[PDB]
């Protein structure tokens, strides 16, 4: 499950 911290800042 990928992790979205902010706008344009999503991580595997």
């Amino acid at each position, epitope marked *: *499950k990928s*992790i*979205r*911290i*902010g*706008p344009g*800042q*999503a*991580f595997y």
Partner: antibody
Amino acid sequence: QVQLVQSGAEVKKPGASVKLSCKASGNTFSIYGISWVRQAPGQGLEWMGGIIPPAGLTNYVQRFQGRVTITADTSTTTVYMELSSLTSEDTAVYYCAIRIGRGFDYWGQGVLVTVSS
Amino acid sequence: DIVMTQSPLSLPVTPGETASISCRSSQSLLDSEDGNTYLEWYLQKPGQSPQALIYEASNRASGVPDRFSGSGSDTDFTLKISRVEAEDVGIYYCMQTIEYPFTFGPGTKVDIKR
């Protein structure tokens, strides 16, 4: 899961600088971001900026004209916000809050910064 | 830059009834690529730190009971609180995270109607 503990209250003269801290403890996340949010007495919430320490990324608000600097110390798992050229209008409670994939899931207790002559 | 508005300013609720508060964004909060809508709701009880209620427009944060629910379009949002009780008194804020800078609505104050 996470607990965020903030430094203590600050009283400053106009033109001075203040450095606040936010220490995270509890569970560990490989990816997270810490933001600072302030609230002037009796007013609403205002987002000031944030950092994503694992990625080396920061985001700031233009209105603050570069007066805010956010830094992180990986070793002590602490995040700092330094606010320079203080004026009376920076008097507020400052919160730190953490994002780990949802919203601001956890918040610090706040710290009152009073700026006055 | 994205402007968030809320309605009403103040909302009295009788005990056990339902509170409904609204939020509007000046732009769509839909991220059409990952399909989520980035709208969050927070509660600040009197004298306390803000706390999370809703994220991605309709999902409840951990520990939030199911009597809190979020819904809406991509621009107009509703926080519904059923079975209102004294502990729900405080100010509710919406906040968008589709775009930097994050921006908050002005807050809606809920109190107990007598």
